[PDB]
Write a protein that binds this ligand. Structure first.
Ligand code: NA
Ligand code: NA
Lengths: 127, 127, 127, 128, 127, 128, 127, 128, 126, 128, 127, 127, 128, 128
């Protein structure tokens, strides 16, 4: 889940370690090996650090109490519904469905059958 | 068992970790290395999280208390009974036996010896 | 992609090996390590084998061998089955039948006798 | 596929190696790592060896060498043994014997003396 | 022992884990890496689960209290006594020794010295 | 670069393999180990496949296939949509529109209607 | 996080080990495998050592309470804002943006919109 | 197959390497990683070395170099030694001696004088 | 020690696991990765199992209280004393030294200097 | 050498791959595994790509492509900015400027107005 | 830190193991995997051993209370000050800077500007 | 330290395991992966075993109380003193220095400055 | 075979590499991973290097290059030193000196003046 | 051989890679995994780079490029520097100065001023 964690950069998360400690802080960096860097983090003992560099071998799991919106995931779901018609545009963080429908994190822009199936997907997706 | 778990996506499962914690939630994603992502999960202390990202190295086992029919598994089993005549169709989630027998999650469709043998097999498949 | 492949059991795939051989046959089994078993396969020299067990270390890539269904044709044949209720939306290459059934090149959306009849039509194309 | 290969012990297989050699012989042993031992194997140059211990790292693929049984001929021979009790079903290429025995190109289903006799017939096709 | 475990598919086994849990259930699946799936399993705390997917890293040992004839093993033992004349036949679960003796899980069938030597071997084999 | 590649989902990429083949197609999926799935991909011999599942051990490199947008042209067109508001800055190859919307070859900064209309022009260049 | 740590060479850090010890000292050396050498480091019991060579397998996490500026990190995020016009200059530890704006750990030097934009980024960078 | 090779210490074996070389010599040592030491070994170019230490990573396969014993010839010679007590059995290519000794191409079953004499004839055949 | 353990097949051994359990049974199977299968085994709590399939990663050590003659071992040793003249014959479990001296589990058969040196070696071996 | 390469972000480099290709472009990113992202890179056939994601397993070596600054020419241009305060030292190929500013081919040592001004001159050599 | 430990061969060090033992002794050997041999070692309980061979997998960290001069590290630092002009000479354990300046653990030999810069570096190195 | 342990074959050593057991016995065999076989060993509880086969993953360290002479190690030391003139002779366990000096475990044979230097070397080696 | 190799320190070996090169020289160092350092080594092209540090991953095999001592010649020369006390024994290719010293192609067994002297003759052959 | 290479920092070495390239340059850095950085290196084609970062997986071997110092010539020069104090000992190719200082092709043994002077003569021989 490197991709999903990349969507949480800048958001608060909790990382539970095999030595029993739990650090909560802003997700600062994630790499392919799942090493993690937290910013302005703290542990249960209430200790605070500008940065905590966490070795991936000791990470049990990472928790988020935040529902955020990931348009790449929406694009994955949209491909199942409009196969061959979906493009994620990292430049504007939008998902294009054909060349007349545009989905952003606020919703679907466009008209007709496609746009209505899309609106329906987006709504499911938001839940 | 990446395949088996993929059939449980969207269903509730329980994941027991080596640090003694147990998470229960909706199986949200599974990769080839078996890292797991649960949605709306909780541990035994009652804490809840929108997402829990579980590193595969600390997962002891994953448990399910649900039946859940897997037509790919039925296809594998049918292949042993009707060698060379079995095809799984992911598009409609059905299994074709020969040119005239069709088996969906609700059962066998067809007539004759083949259909009777498939019906016996489908029934035992549901254990 | 163990899960995506497992969804192709019984379908014909091509496996390109790093020794330059190319084997085409029915996908019989895939494991977590991506070892692959092909049933009734053949190589470029035209030799045929009932079963081929492929070590994952030598697999360069696996390719789909079937063209997706022609949705304009699907609409053509479907209009005859559901007169006055078929529509082909060129915008997303999708076919709508009535107002509760939707067909894309990867499947049939909806439930009911029309949904069901459309899955049989779709499967017929696949054969 | 350790399990599937273990089910072929004593059967003839072909093993393609990444140095271009190809050995055909009786599958003698398979281990978890997929190291393979063949008995009375030979290569394309015609050299013959009582045993060949093949390192898993150089195995590209292992292939079956036997063709599946001709079910119509099986049906013909079963007919002589169970007069009037045999039915060939083209729809799946299966042969039915009486009301309790079913034979596919992969084996005999059923129990009892007819099933036992059918297995024996099946095996006679494999020895050829 | 992937091959031995395969001979126990559908049979009840006990799996002792590193975390101290012990699950008993029907051996439903085993792969090359020795991950294990039990069906209808229960632990020492009495909980029952339809499926338990156990990660190989945490399995200490697998135990069986049943005697289960494995004709593949008999074939291996026969090969040391009748070198070059043995063949396990998966299609019927029989071991052929030479051209005229056949051995099933019920015992030896045949006539002569070969049958006699095989009879003694099968008796030793049963214990 | 799992995260960077995930950001190209649905865009066309080129994947060069160690056996000499090169597959061009839309990135359909990328996992942590960098196995890649391409959709409607084709190779140099011209063969096309609806899906190509590429094993990570054999991937040498993955290349972007799209050229970046010509900012000078973007500027020209933004003007005939935002007269007297467009300014192309050579110093950074950036185009400014009004006083609160900035556009580079990888995005538009800003909020509000002018920022939104600009993302749409950007998207139009991307579509072709 | 080999890169981030490298920026902390000469600075005081705390390294938490899986045997329960915690060493605080100057980060003297870090390699690609994340082995770490600390200088004049002490553990909680109060023992100090001129050098402590810590094996990466036993490192849970590294923590820093300082806010050290990394012009490399500034250059990475400057590249997201001025794609293709950002160069980090190890020789003088400065980031060049175009041919007339230059950012040091002190701040932005240059004028016009580029300078202004950079000033906004550098200032944010300082959080 | 470390156990199997360890049973060939002192016997002549052929080791095919991924660089194209083939060394045949006496198996001197095998470890669990299947590194192999041959003594008095030679390659195809005819070079001979008193010891060759082969790294497991480059080993493709290891082959037996001896043919199994001619059992009909063994029976002919056991017959001179045990008048009217020897019988070759073609069904399994085994030689029976008296009622308590049995010889396959892999060894002798039985205990006592006849068995011990049978083992020495077998060995004489291996030394040829 | 895959080869030494193979010599103990069919013999009783003890396997100590890192979870603290200790199983005692007949060594039934051992593979190159040192996974071990025990037959008729039992643990310190008295529980009996027809088969115990032990994963190599949890095995600390394996113990044997029996002295068991391994002729391949004698062959390794004989090779140091009679370089180039030694061969282990698996077919008969015998070690041949030169072509007139034969050593089995019960001893040296042959005459002359070679046989005398082999007897001394075999005696030491046991 | 993850740290050494991270210090080269934004600078031009060349990456040689075991498939024989060679890409030259601006170092865009380097991870702990030594996977490399090059921006605006081109291979030896002249093809160009906005981004090339290179898998570490296939990288033979990475080479710096810029020549170090010519220190004789640096002292020359520097005398013009710092009249009578510049000394070129043949012994170590270093340039002294005044009494507290030192310049080698890898940087400027010193602090204050002269040091600042000489870093900007060093930088201009690197810009061209 | 294989290089650094080699500089400590023949000097006293302590090695802390993950089973809780601590051995103090003369560093006798270090290999690339960081296995370690100690001569005339002792543990906290006071037992003494001529040799203690320590498996690298169990070493948490190695510590030294001695300040040991390593001319190779001086050569590393000097190379940053006199790029392209530095050479470590193992035959004499000296660092040549240019053609007229020589540095030993005794000090800098030579005259001129280079020698003076080298002397500040050395006095600093001995910090 | 496979080489150093080989020199101890036949000598008593102690092996400390991560489960806390300690075995003392004759070093019977050691392989490249450092698996160890002990002959006639005993543990702290006083149980004795003909053979103890110790998996390398569980070995923390191996200890020896004997001072044993390793002529190969002396050869490695002599090569630093007599570069290019040293040869270890496994056949007779001696070290040849040049053509006229021979060193066995009871000392130096030879006359002249080479013999004198080798004697100082050997005396130290013994310490 | 780290232990067997460590017993050849100072002796000449040949190392065959997967890139096709072959280096022959004095075995200088060997570690647990079987990396090898050779002293005064040369390849087939005739180049010589004072030290060659060989990465284990590329080593196909290592071969001793010294032939074993001709024992008949050893016996001949031992007869000039121990008149009438030497017997060459063709049976095992061993040389007996008196009744307490025995010499094989790999060593001398025995204690005392005769044994010590035979060890020096043995070494004189190894030095040739 | 991490430690042995770290002792060659600043010295010239040759690194042979498995893609067939051979780089010669100053050893700038070596890490525990044997990744290697060369400074001002060149390949056989004559291309040179101020820095080359070589990936350990492609390094076949690293070779010393300097010849050891001529000890006879060293002696002939230690003479005009230490009249009547120098003896060249052929038996080990060693040079003795006075009776407390000893030089081998690997370095100087001894302490005090005669030793220091010896070390500097030794370095003059090494320098070019
Ligand atoms: Na539980
Ligand atoms: Na015990």
């Amino acid at each position: 889940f490197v991709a999903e964690l990349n969507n949480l950069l800048g958001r608060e998360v909790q990382v539970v370690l095999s030595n029993g400690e739990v650090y909560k802080g802003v997700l600062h960096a994630v790499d392919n090996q799942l090493n993690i860097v937290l910013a302005n983090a703290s542990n249960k003992a209430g200790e605070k650090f500008n940065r905590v560099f966490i070795m991936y071998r000791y990470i049990v799991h990472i928790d988020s109490t935040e529902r955020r919106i990931d348009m790449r995931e929406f694009a994955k779901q949209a491909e199942k519904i409009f196969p061959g018609m979906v493009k994620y545009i990292e430049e504007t963080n939008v998902v294009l469905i054909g060349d007349k429908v545009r989905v952003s994190e606020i919703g679907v822009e466009g008209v007709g059958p496609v746009a209505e199936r899309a609106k329906r997907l987006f709504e499911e997706f938001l839940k």
